[PDB]
Amino acid sequence: MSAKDERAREILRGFKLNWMNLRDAETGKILWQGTEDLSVPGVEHEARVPKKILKCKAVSRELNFSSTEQMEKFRLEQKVYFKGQCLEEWFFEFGFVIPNSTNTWQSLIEAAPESQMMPASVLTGNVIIETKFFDDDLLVSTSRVRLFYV
């Protein structure tokens, strides 16, 4: 708690998400780039992404973040909710973060089989992604994004 509550607060104080991209994994074409910082806890962020990303066989997600604090095991846990039902659960690991560094983090996200794909018009506005930001076992922040497919 309080000893790590303060550590979590220090890391979060010095953390910034600079930008986020979605690229088609095959062609490299940027499909979406994020404006509003989506990591900020306490508010429900919104994101409007092109419906064609659902047709990609795979997308590359790129996060660029800065951290004044060192981290030994920077990682994300993401829960994807559809109308409140957990649809997906994902774990992403970055590892060691140098103090005062700026880092690009790339994660490959493949499409579900076509027979299990859901239509954009059904998903849009009904998807919440809850992201937990950890440094090893230390929970730093929890943030939420509501997803629209435009």
Added chain:
Amino acid sequence: GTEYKLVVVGAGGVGKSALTIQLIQNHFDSYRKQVVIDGETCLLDILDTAGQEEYSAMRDQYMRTGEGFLCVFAINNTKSFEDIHHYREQIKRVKDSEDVPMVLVGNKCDLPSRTVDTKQAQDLARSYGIPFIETSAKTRQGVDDAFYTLVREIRKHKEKMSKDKKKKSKTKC
């Protein structure tokens, strides 16, 4: 043909060499032996650690390459029983795994001067979640049962690992 790398550990003088010789040559330094267990022909690569244990590189190597371990104490030697946890903790650390196929072996069960009760050995093995088998290398009692039970432990672990649908995303997010 499935091969199995078995490693016999335990304090000096508990009977690691006698157990190995009984399994191999049927009478009272690794060795490859073909055996039929549960109707399946198995190649057993058996290492008696009596010689190698005192050399750090050797001990680390046989703990890395061993697939299952017979942890042997002698039922008339309390200090050999107390040493068991040192071997188990070493193997686990080397393997960085809490699920290492293992069988607890109480050898020399032909001796009446017993100082380690079967119940306390059974309690140790229960706390580890591993089988416990009493043997006499002198009379051959339990010898095959100990090595075959360990092979079965390895088989169960290997079947677990080769079963533990890589998941994909409906949202791309």
